[PDB]
């Protein structure tokens, strides 16, 4: 009772402080206008639903994960298939492309994160390390570098690892529901993870404890990503909405939803400038939102099934998009 | 035209050849989602047709008449399943195992089936059901204790259905209870959708053989019904 009373008092104080500093009728910023988005390439070869796709660092290679049990490295320029790794378990839910391009990580319902070295050129690709230690399904693996991965799980815990030794280094245990997506900050030191409970938390990989806790959603959080600067991040939740959390304000700024949209949001990504929030939806088409003015900006129709994957390039030229239609689509502006 | 681009198109061609070879074997295999509860003998069902031959999923590849089913039991996951079950949007069937000889937690077995049935990403998915441990039900109703009407008030004004086919030398009260239990799930099944998917209930014990042929036949029926409905022939 006393502990519960103390927690309630702390929550009341936090809410009062947050609402006190809440100082948008602003016509100064110009509208983006209608976004013209045209499919330039359509990547074909995957056998089942695309459920994970990660862009390469050179903005030309990309990795794509499909429930047929396939991790494909595509050359988005010539549409040539650079690599085709057959996964040990076909229920992959996330994939990673190491920022050096040397390694790809993938994980799924097998509770482990498999690592593959791309640059061997003796036989073919091989599994370098099978990082086990999660008791729930992996939702989002990412590379800090060639020897550190951060990994989300369906056991409510995030984990920072060390591929060389094969064991965990830090564990992050502040979430109550399943964690579905994590985004590394640009400074590559803290990551933000969103959970089935309507909460998203920061994590410093050095210490390993929550920095902030973010709420405001009404259902599961399916996808998360960082704003280009490490000062904000957007969540796409299963109650058919997106929200933007800023750390400095430590509160809500902008929520993106429509009375028409009734289905949840499966993927969220940001363009290079941060003005175009790209969100894949359950009702089969992507939508690009204008981050500043909080209005519609455009649609990406062409996918016969649910849109799972949505990744902008490092240089911002292309926008891949996977879906349950089994096709990846490279998009561009005319 | 260049030598490096020549090699690029060369191994891309080799990769697409491998991808087509993999597509042939992928589309000829049928993926099953095995579900159940702790008291429902999923493990015994798995390790009774295993002869047909920290980790977060177990895969049993079994073969009935060279159709090559891959049944994916789920171990070492959290109790929640609202998120990782959407991966099975495209499975041939969901094999649902129930232990209908307890009468206490049979209700959330019913709500579990109702949740599986009524979920999108599973609206087209047919659910096979194995009402497991029928000998437990028979011995529980033969002893005369723990009456179902205590836990289900509509079992008193329920009668054995006409279509029922009791096995010879089998008590009428036990088959009445059995078919009432089956008809509860069937009442949940024949209440939502429109011919998109159907429930296929069975009665299985712990040591029942020929259990794989049931997934085989009900998968055949699922595929036939889907085709017949797309040809407007049903």
């Amino acid at each position, epitope marked *: 009772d006393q502990l519960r009373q103390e927690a309630e008092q702390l929550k009341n104080q936090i809410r009062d402080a947050r609402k006190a500093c809440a100082d948008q009728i602003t016509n100064n910023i110009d509208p983006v206008g209608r976004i013209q988005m045209r499919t330039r390439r359509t990547l074909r070869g995957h056998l089942a639903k695309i459920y994970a796709m990660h862009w390469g660092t050179d903005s030309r290679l990309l990795v794509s994960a499909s429930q047929d049990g396939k991790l494909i490295i595509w050359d988005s320029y010539t549409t040539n298939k650079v690599h085709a790794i057959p996964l040990r378990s076909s229920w992959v839910m996330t994939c990673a492309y190491a920022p050096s391009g040397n390694y790809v990580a993938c994980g799924g319902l097998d509770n482990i994160c498999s690592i593959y070295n791309l640059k061997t050129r003796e036989g073919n690709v091989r599994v370098s390390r099978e990082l086990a230690g999660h008791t729930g399904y992996l939702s989002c693996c990412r590379f800090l570098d060639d020897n550190q991965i951060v990994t989300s799980s369906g056991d409510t815990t995030c984990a920072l690892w060390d591929i060389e030794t094969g064991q965990q280094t830090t564990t992050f245990t502040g979430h109550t*529901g399943d964690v579905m997506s994590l985004s590394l900050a640009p400074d590559t030191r803290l990551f933000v993870s969103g959970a089935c409970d309507a909460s998203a938390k920061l994590w410093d990989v050095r210490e390993g404890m929550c920095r902030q806790t973010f709420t405001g959603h009404e259902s599961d959080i399916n996808a998360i990503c960082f704003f280009p600067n490490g000062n904000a991040f957007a969540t796409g939740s299963d*109650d058919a909405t997106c929200r933007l959390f800023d750390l400095r304000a430590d509160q809500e700024l902008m929520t993106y939803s429509h009375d028409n949209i009734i289905c949840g949001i499966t993927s969220v990504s940001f363009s290079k400038s941060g003005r175009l929030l790209l969100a894949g939806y359950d009702d089969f088409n992507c939508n690009v939102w204008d981050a500043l003015k909080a209005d519609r900006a455009g649609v990406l129709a062409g996918h016969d099934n649910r849109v799972s994957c949505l990744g902008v390039t490092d240089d911002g030229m292309a926008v891949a998009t996977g879906s349950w239609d089994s096709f990846l689509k490279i998009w561009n502006g005319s | 035209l260049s030598a490096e681009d020549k090699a690029a198109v060369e191994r891309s061609k080799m990769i697409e050849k491998q991808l087509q070879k993999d597509k042939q074997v992928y589309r000829a295999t049928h993926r099953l989602l095995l579900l159940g509860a702790d008291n429902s003998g999923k493990s015994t069902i798995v390790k009774q047709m295993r002869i047909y031959h920290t980790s977060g999923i177990f895969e049993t590849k079994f073969q009935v008449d060279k159709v090559n089913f891959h049944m994916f039991d789920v171990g070492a996951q959290r109790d929640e*399943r609202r998120k990782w079950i959407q991966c099975f949007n495209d499975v041939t069937a969901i094999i649902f195992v129930v232990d209908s000889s307890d009468y206490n937690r049979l209700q959330e077995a019913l*709500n579990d089936f*109702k*949740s599986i049935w009524n*979920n999108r990403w599973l609206r087209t998915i047919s659910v096979i059901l194995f009402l497991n441990k029928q000998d437990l039900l028979a011995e529980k109703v033969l002893a005369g204790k723990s009456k179902i009407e205590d836990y289900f008030p*509509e079992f008193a004004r329920y009668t054995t259905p006409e279509d029922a086919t009791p096995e010879p030398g089998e008590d009428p009260r036990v088959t009445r209870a059995k078919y009432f239990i089956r008809d509860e799930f069937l009442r949940i099944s024949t209440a939502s959708g429109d011919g998109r998917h159907y429930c296929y209930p069975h009665f299985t014990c712990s040591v029942d053989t020929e259990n794989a042929r049931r997934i085989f036949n009900d998968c055949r029926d699922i595929i036939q019904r889907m085709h017949l409905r797309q040809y407007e022939l049903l």
Partner: nanobody
Amino acid sequence: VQLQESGGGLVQPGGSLRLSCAASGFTFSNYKMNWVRQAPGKGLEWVSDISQSGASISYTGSVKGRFTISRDNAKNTLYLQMNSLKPEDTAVYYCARCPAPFTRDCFDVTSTTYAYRGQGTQVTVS
């Protein structure tokens, strides 16, 4: 998101009670709702069920006819009227939402941990 369940107490068998659950942080009207009870020495069992706007109502077999459930989406408060008690009803009662709106099935209300469930009200029968 926080669901607060009111009422609860010790009542002699055959008494009456009113369980009022107040929900905040979401549009109450779009979500199917449930009552789940946990008895001492047993796991959580689902008890009552009401759809988005009272279109459908359901109960477990041991509770059919006796207890009743209604919605107050205007007041954002769900109500369970309790009468004709039994010694087996001594338990903690939780008002459970279910994950996604506009949805006709609800997952993981009976689970050991649910992302957002009420603290619970204890009801005891003499």
